């Protein structure tokens, strides 16, 4: 009449299985077996499966063979009981009852049953709640559960077929998603951005839920399921009521699961893992409980970063106001929709690695399609000659060889010993010609300058200003896998959508941020005052270098050093519309073509041309000004820049006619006063650590976001976006 287990408050054990002809029911038995505080089975029923001469040995062995060919844990009899015989419990759906009930032995719980259940499926709802239900929410209850719960038919299961279900918190006795959603690592896999381990908790999870470091199974099953639900339907807010029905496990443990799913769900949304992207919501639809709502924030700048954080905080239930200096939202996302049936970005338009990219998520949510680039990119000389495939392969080989040795040279150098990448390449190159008396033609040298300029484009600067040590610092961290895409409708759709329904003040350049008093005083250049409890700055790096905002108290010297160790990198775009697709014969449907430079100084002058209609019907070309060439273009007017582009094209297509363009634009980001750059890079002397230091909040009061604050993913719209999500999460925590 007492439990085997030490310190069980089972003052009256009953047998849940009643499978043996001799069940003790609620009587005396040689030994009561304990599965939980409220769950026990009798020695006779124990024997009914455990011993070979009884009727339940057939069952026990079939299950046991499966649990081994599909599992990694011990197939103990207590495990068979918890997986196969323990009754289910389901909570009444009637708003005013909400009581938990035991279903009878033979009923198999399904989501449909959980969705709709009501007591008695007399006033059935008025019968008292089995007292064992309250018992489940005592901290010690879980400590006295023998085995950890394993979920049945988890939505996560199809995505986890490479793991043992029990290691990911699922039952071994079990068994059309967007190709870019790959939220779980596979076992023995290369690093990729925004992937979680399904079988290990990550640092913020261990921090938030310390109680699961002893045993992470319950958390992992619930976290994995939640993610898989989010990714199966990313167009709706994912809520506890949509989760509960998909939690299928026997016994009172299921009651502990649905109580935890809430806490986990709110953690996941705060951190921006689910219920994010372009999901709009409100008012009585806020994603985080009343508990986070009472607070206010001012966000400065309405580009991807500021809009990300604004969207998140607003969805959370928090009061947000955004102050934008310009007469438009978007920042360095600025789309031209005036070309015939083609959208051309003056700023951002490529998505670099789509797998697990939030931009690919948002394209889902919006039903937008992206054009994946082809690999081909011929290197056309002036005037006409496509570069020999062998010559192209030789110079590519050497160029990357030079990068290898730069990488070998840097391993023992400190910041105080940094040299510019440009210098360290030329040297190694000159050292190499000397060493081995090979001679390159004028052409092979020009092909080298193409690659060199292509690095200049990536960095947004001449190679003589960029750190050899730290130019590719971010590749320390896992990077976005998969396709590079043309975002054909433009990033402006995502922007417009994130901004929809938020409080945005345009033409309100901020000048003063005072964080001395009880709350933050923000003052525009015309003297308009705003105040809030928190402030988030997302202005571009170059504006922080020019000190365009007065900070009171001043930013630390440690911050200024980081701010100044990064470059405000720059590129300019030219776009040209033509009467017809003059390049088709020669280019043959390739997405872009290269322009081999005639000389080192001219290398950043339209190095690559992008065909802007992936449907290959309209005729729009885009090209880029990088490196030295940005300097040489600052005094020239738009028409003069055009002329050089046209002269370049007529050299590239020397043996044919090229039409006159019928419309164009030339970008002047460099002299946009609230922007003054294209993207950040590490100047010589710097470290990637500078991104983290800029990212550090001040006094849990002043926060920073933007591409120049994201160490993992600098430069990009994506990087900017994720920095806004990071800060919204930190702001909501407080």
């Amino acid at each position: 009449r007492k439990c085997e287990k030490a310190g069980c408050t089972a003052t009256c054990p009953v047998c849940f299985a009643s499978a043996s002809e001799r069940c003790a029911k609620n009587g005396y038995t040689s030994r009561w077996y304990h599965l939980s505080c409220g769950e026990h089975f009798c020695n006779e029923c124990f024997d009914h499966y455990y011993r070979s001469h009884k009727d339940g040995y057939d069952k026990y062995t079939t299950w046991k063979k499966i649990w081994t060919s599909n599992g990694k844990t011990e197939p103990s009899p207590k495990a068979f009981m918890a997986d196969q015989q323990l009754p289910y419990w389901v909570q009444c759906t009637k708003p005013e009852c909400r009581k938990w009930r035991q279903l009878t032995k033979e009923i198999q719980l399904t989501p449909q049953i959980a969705k709709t259940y009501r007591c008695g499926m007399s006033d059935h709802c008025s019968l008292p709640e089995d007292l064992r239900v309250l018992e489940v929410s005592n901290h010690w209850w879980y400590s006295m559960l023998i085995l950890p719960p394993l979920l049945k038919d988890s939505v996560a299961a199809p995505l986890l077929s490479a793991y043992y279900p029990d290691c990911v918190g699922m039952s071994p006795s079990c068994t059309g998603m967007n190709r870019y959603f790959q939220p779980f690592y596979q076992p023995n896999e290369c690093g990729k951005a925004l992937c979680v381990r399904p079988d290990v908790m990550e640092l913020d999870e261990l921090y938030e839920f310390p109680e699961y470091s002893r045993d992470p199974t319950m958390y992992l099953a619930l976290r994995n399921l939640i993610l898989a639900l989010w990714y199966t339907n990313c167009k709706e807010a994912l809520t506890p009521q949509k989760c509960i029905p998909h939690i299928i496990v026997r016994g009172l443990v299921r009651i502990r699961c649905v109580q935890e799913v809430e806490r986990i769900l709110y953690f996941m949304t705060r951190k921006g893992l689910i219920n994010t992207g372009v999901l709009s919501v409100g008012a009585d639809q806020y994603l985080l409980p009343k508990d986070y709502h009472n607070k206010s924030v001012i966000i400065i700048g309405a580009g991807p970063a500021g809009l990300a954080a604004a969207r998140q905080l607003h969805n959370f239930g928090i009061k947000v106001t955004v102050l934008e200096a310009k007469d438009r939202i978007g920042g360095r996302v600025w789309d031209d929709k005036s070309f015939k049936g083609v959208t051309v970005g003056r700023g951002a338009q490529i998505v670099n690695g789509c797998i697990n990219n939030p931009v690919a998520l948002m394209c889902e949510q919006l039903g937008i399609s992206m054009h994946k680039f082809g690999e081909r990119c011929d290197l056309i000389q002036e005037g006409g000659r496509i570069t020999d495939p062998t010559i192209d392969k030789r110079m590519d080989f050497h160029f990357n060889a030079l990068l290898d040795v730069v990488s070998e040279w840097r391993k023992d150098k400190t910041q105080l010993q940094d040299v510019p990448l440009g210098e360290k390449i030329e040297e190694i190159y000159k050292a190499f010609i000397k060493e081995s008396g090979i001679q390159f033609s004028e052409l092979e040298g020009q092909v080298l300058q193409f690659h060199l300029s292509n690095l200049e484009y990536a960095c947004g600067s001449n190679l003589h200003q960029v750190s050899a040590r730290s130019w590719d610092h971010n590749e320390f961290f896992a990077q976005f896998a998969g396709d590079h895409t043309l975002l054909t409708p433009g990033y402006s759709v995502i922007i417009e959508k994130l901004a929809e329904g938020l409080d945005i003040q345009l033409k309100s350049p901020v000048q003063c941020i005072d964080y001395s008093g009880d709350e933050v005083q923000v003052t525009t250049t015309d003297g308009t005052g705003y105040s809030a409890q928190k402030v988030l700055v997302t202005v571009p790096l170059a504006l922080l270098q020019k000190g365009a905002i007065q900070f009171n108290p001043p930013l630390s010297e440690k911050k200024m050093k980081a701010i100044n160790s990064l470059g405000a990198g720059i590129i300019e775009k030219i776009a040209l519309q033509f009467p017809y697709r003059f390049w088709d014969s020669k280019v043959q449907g390739a997405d872009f073509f290269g322009h081999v430079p005639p000389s080192a100084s001219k290398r950043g002058l339209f190095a690559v041309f992008y065909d802007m209609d992936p449907q290959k019907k309209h005729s729009v070309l885009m090209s880029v000004i990088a490196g030295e060439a940005v300097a040489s273009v600052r005094t020239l007017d738009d028409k003069q820049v055009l002329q050089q582009c046209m002269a370049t094209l007529r050299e590239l297509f020397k043996e044919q006619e090229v039409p006159d363009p019928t419309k164009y634009f030339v970008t002047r980001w460099s002299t946009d006063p609230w922007i003054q750059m294209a993207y950040s890079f590490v100047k010589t002397g710097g470290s990637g650590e500078a991104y983290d230091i800029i990212a550090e909040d001040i006094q849990g009061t002043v926060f920073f976001a933007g591409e120049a604050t994201n160490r993992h993913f600098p430069q990009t719209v994506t990087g900017a976006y994720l920095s806004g999500v990071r800060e919204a999460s930190k702001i909501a925590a407080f």
């Binding site: 690592y185 076992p187 023995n188 896999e189 290369c190 690093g191 381990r197 490529i350 670099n352 690695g353 680039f373 990119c377 160029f399 990357n400 060889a401 030079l402 990068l403 290898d404 730069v406 990488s407 193409f450 690659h451 292509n454 690095l455 484009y457 990536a458 960095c459 947004g460 130019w471 590719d472 610092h473 971010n474 590749e475 320390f476 990077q479 976005f480 590079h484 997405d591 872009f592 290269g594 690559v608 992008y610 993207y679 890079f681 993913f713 600098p714 430069q715 990009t716």
Partner: peptide, 20 residues
Amino acid sequence: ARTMQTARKSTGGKAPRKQL
């Protein structure tokens, strides 16, 4: 940063690839 490259990605100078 190298990650900005689409057309004609540079390959050299990477760290030894990492697996779980």
